[PDB]
């Protein structure tokens, strides 16, 4: 049917946050599974648990803390979600994407979406960072789009375009800068496909997603990106390739959450250095 | 707990009987007008207008580019009823509301449903302003559960497991093609597969390429549910798309799909749509 | 919050009710597909429960599906058989569709055998073929329709279960090698089952999509049960009866239809019973 939040609910939450912190973020960063350590490098950090914040969705997941952290990252005013919400948990997409519109109302102009993802492109290795050039929204094709229902004109248009969702200039700048990281592995770029989960893919399903032209797969991110673009936010995205999706019947290996968290923790230092360089490539407001 | 149709058989019947007792018109053909195609009701003679708000059990709309009215009349001498303004899944309607009027038309005594829409071109040979005959569809929402027949089957309308391989009437499409060839028009009448996606946001480049790889020639957010319900209750079905824009299929382009361009393409093709709908009426069999 | 309406206690109450109303203690659960209800005929010492008798069990009406649970022995192996499954197209949410699978787990079943009728997408399949399910494509699952959606119950399984090993490798190898004993002209087929919601049959363009995706057979069931089975640690074996060849060209005047599907089931019933008999012998014992 429809979004349960009114415009006033988003506004009340934003105003509450603005009156309880001196921080005025330009960039919002959503931290994915095992990527919560990205909040460690924030200076002058102020923490809000989701339970404190009016209208915020309330449950957990292990690997995802449940807190909003305001601070400076490489001198840039940021707000960071440590713990995102997923459709597989039972949330409708208008709950999943609620914070994105809150960030818009806080005065954020840029959303950085991060996630763990399974590698579908065979040239990707575990520990690679893949810039999200584009996505395939499989749930969206069937009806599961966060904009379903009446459009709120105060956020955006009825029929927003998504062909330019992942900012071209930021990706070019992130690629050219990656020279400064001094890494053996080059920065990957490709298409993220969203599937609902929560179960991992079969071999046949992996091959479907490969045939469709997806380079990495996950269960998040796309709804947030749609809502961000709907309200005019610049969007940058990247995936940590935490595992190679099983694509043959001979293998005895199986995708599993423990391996996903481990890959996150092993890459944590490299992710923090990359997000630092990323802040320098973000245009200022106005 | 059980996901089912909220309308009873009696609700459809009450709406049909209400319409039949408030107009002298007895339509054979129902025509659903797509986005920017509402001007197709202008050529109706002896027109009688009902706003959807007047009609019992009818859904109440909310889209700009879609008026919200049922128009009875004669189109090229043929008794028609026309929907100016359809309902979409992206608006929040369940598919049993979206397709409600199709069963009403069946109960009015309509034997043919003409479905029209605006669509994005996926086939690179299509140009803006082309008319594509719908030979077939790909029902992506249907694969996942979003089918208008979900829930208990009403035997009074049709079977539990209706076939869709013959949904778009073969004879009407052949007649439309042969009649077009006789006109000696330079630009050909196109024919292809329509893929339904829910929307309401437009496709990414990667998504466009998915739909191309799947063998779709045009994409939109409607039509397929109506066609399924029509075929379920035995209606003959004819479909066509106005190609209102070419879907963005590369990352170099600065162009973006947008509603304003879609409406504009509709208005620009008005003359060509009227000539096409004229030939179309001639290709529809009379009742027994 | 979109969640399972059953608590752990509901599953447990249903299992305990069944355990206290039959002396049978099944090791293997078998779900009978459309026109495959005759698989319950070879059960010895049979005890029948109608679904209406059983607490918390879903209730309602499809033709070709009886609506009963049958406990008994099949080739000397303790079985429980569903004659009549539930489908998403009927209006049931997937947590109702898959409810019996968790009940079987709590009865002490360690193996689920899933059977179905399916449309042939692979052109080498003929009507009457048995296709071993090596793998599946869960199209509804991609979009959100997964029976595990909502809070995970740790007492059944993990939050993020793997499905790449869903169809037991050893049982498929044993079923293939044994099929020699059946003495059939047609070899045992093996392939990928794609689930679509239905209830309407595929268009030609849709058939070609499913072929391009690498599916060998198509149906409207089975996959949700398999996911819930694997979530709670059950060994899973699956097969499809190819009841019709899906229409893949516009020249054909033939149309898929339920009557032809039921007829194909009844014609293959004897062969299915002999195959399920050999299948029970290839299932490992408990502990
Ligand atoms: N679908 C999918 N998602 C993921 C993810 C991303 N998320 C990580 C977490 C499971 O560990 C879920 O929220 C999905 C990592 N690897 C994979 C994979 O192989 N497949
Ligand atoms: N999905 C999709 N639909 C359309 C349509 C059809 N409708 C037109 C209207 C948005 O302008 C929606 O109801 C969809 C035209 N062009 C396109 C396109 O490029 N994509
Ligand atoms: N989708 C699909 N399903 C089936 C089935 C399996 N079920 C059989 C029954 C309709 O006859 C539905 O429950 C689906 C047999 N043939 C086909 C087919 O061609 N297509």
């Amino acid at each position: 049917m429809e979004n349960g939040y009114t415009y006033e609910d988003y506004k009340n939450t934003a105003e509450w946050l603005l009156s309880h912190t001196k921080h005025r973020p330009q960039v919002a960063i959503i931290c994915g599974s095992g990527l919560g350590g990205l909040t460690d490098k924030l200076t002058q950090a102020q923490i809000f648990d989701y339970s404190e914040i009016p209208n915020f969705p309330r449950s957990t997941v292990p690997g995802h803390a449940g807190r909003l952290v305001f601070g400076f990252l490489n001198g840039r005013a940021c707000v960071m979600m440590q713990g995102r919400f997923h459709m597989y948990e039972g949330y409708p997409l208008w709950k999943v994407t609620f914070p994105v519109r809150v960030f818009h109302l806080l005065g954020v102009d840029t959303l950085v979406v991060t996630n763990a993802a399974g590698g579908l492109n065979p040239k990707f290795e575990v520990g690679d960072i893949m810039l999200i050039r584009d996505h395939i929204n499989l749930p969206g094709f069937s009806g599961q789009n966060p904009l379903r229902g009446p459009n709120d004109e105060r956020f955006g248009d009825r029929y927003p375009a998504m062909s330019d969702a992942y900012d071209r200039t930021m990706r070019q700048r992130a690629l050219s800068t990656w020279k400064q990281m001094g890494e053996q592995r080059e920065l990957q770029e490709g298409t993220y496909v969203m599937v609902a989960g929560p179960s991992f893919e079969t071999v046949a399903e992996c091959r479907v997603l490969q045939k469709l032209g997806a380079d990495a797969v996950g269960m998040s991110t796309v709804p947030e990106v749609i809502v961000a673009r709907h309200c005019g936010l610049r969007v940058f995205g990247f995936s940590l390739i935490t595992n190679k999706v099983i694509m043959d019947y001979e293998s005895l290996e199986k995708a599993n959450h423990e391996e996903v968290l481990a890959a996150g923790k092993q890459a944590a230092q490299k992710l923090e250095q990359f997000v630092s360089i990323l802040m320098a490539s973000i245009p200022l407001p106005d």
Side-chain angles (χ1 to χ4, degrees), chain A residues 2-178 180-183 185-286:
Chain A
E2 68 179 304
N3 190 352
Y5 296 114
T6 61
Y7 185 87
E8 287 63 32
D9 294 324
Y10 299 102
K11 188 68 181 181
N12 289 343
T13 299
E15 291 303 320
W16 189 92
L17 289 166
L18 290 170
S19 69
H20 285 78
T21 188
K22 303 171 162 155
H23 289 285
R24 294 287 174 278
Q26 293 166 12
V27 182
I29 308 171
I30 300 175
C31 301
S33 297
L35 310 187
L38 287 170
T39 60
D40 297 330
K41 274 281 138 64
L42 287 176
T43 60
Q44 296 85 46
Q46 188 179 343
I47 300 166
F48 291 96
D49 295 322
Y50 295 163
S51 51
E52 300 175 52
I53 308 166
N55 308 316
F56 232 80
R58 310 290 186 201
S59 194
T60 66
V61 165
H64 280 287
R67 64 183 205 179
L68 214 62
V69 194
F70 293 80
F72 290 95
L73 192 53
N74 191 35
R76 203 59 172 265
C78 292
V79 58
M80 304 190 65
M81 272 178 81
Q82 191 176 348
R84 57 140 69 73
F85 312 106
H86 301 89
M87 192 172 50
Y88 63 72
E89 291 170 79
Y91 295 113
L93 293 179
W94 56 264
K95 276 196 176 152
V96 170
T97 59
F98 171 82
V100 175
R101 285 171 170 186
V102 169
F103 303 147
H104 170 60
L105 296 182
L106 297 175
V108 167
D109 299 326
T110 305
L111 179 67
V112 177
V113 289
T114 77
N115 60 53
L120 303 168
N121 194 314
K123 86 203 178 197
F124 295 173
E125 297 296 340
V126 173
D128 279 346
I129 297 170
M130 188 201 72
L131 297 192
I132 299 169
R133 175 161 65 159
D134 207 355
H135 68 233
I136 299 166
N137 187 6
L138 293 186
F141 286 163
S142 302
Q144 291 286 2
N145 186 303
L147 305 174
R148 195 192 180 199
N151 184 59
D152 319 309
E153 295 283 301
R154 291 174 280 182
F155 286 114
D157 296 328
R158 169 74 288 187
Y159 310 107
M162 296 294 148
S163 54
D164 66 337
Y166 298 91
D167 189 75
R168 186 175 178 96
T169 307
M170 277 191 69
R171 293 193 281 94
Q172 290 170 354
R173 282 164 175 170
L175 286 160
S176 310
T177 58
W178 179 265
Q180 302 169 36
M181 295 266 307
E183 283 283 340
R185 289 293 290 180
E186 299 300 333
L187 192 57
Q188 307 300 323
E189 194 172 37
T191 296
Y192 177 91
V193 61
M194 190 200 176
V195 298
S199 49
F200 289 112
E201 290 70 40
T202 65
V203 168
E205 287 164 359
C206 171
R207 290 172 185 176
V208 167
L209 302 176
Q210 289 169 332
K211 284 172 179 197
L212 263 25
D215 299 293
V217 56
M219 313 173 182
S220 78
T221 305
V222 171
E224 286 109 305
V225 171
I226 289 162
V227 169
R229 294 300 299 156
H230 183 247
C231 68
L233 289 163
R234 182 185 299 103
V235 175
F236 182 85
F238 69 93
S239 295
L240 185 71
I241 306 304
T242 54
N243 56 296
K244 305 223 296 183
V245 178
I246 306 306
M247 64 185 284
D248 64 75
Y249 298 102
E250 289 60 44
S251 172
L252 281 298
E253 299 249 280
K254 293 170 66 167
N256 63 98
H257 191 53
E258 180 188 313
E259 180 204 355
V260 171
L261 295 184
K265 161 201 81 210
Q266 290 291 294
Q269 279 198 289
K270 179 171 76 169
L271 294 183
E272 105 195 344
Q273 199 196 139
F274 177 72
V275 175
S276 169
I277 288 153
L278 173 60
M279 294 304 96
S281 314
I282 294 175
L284 292 162
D286 305 352

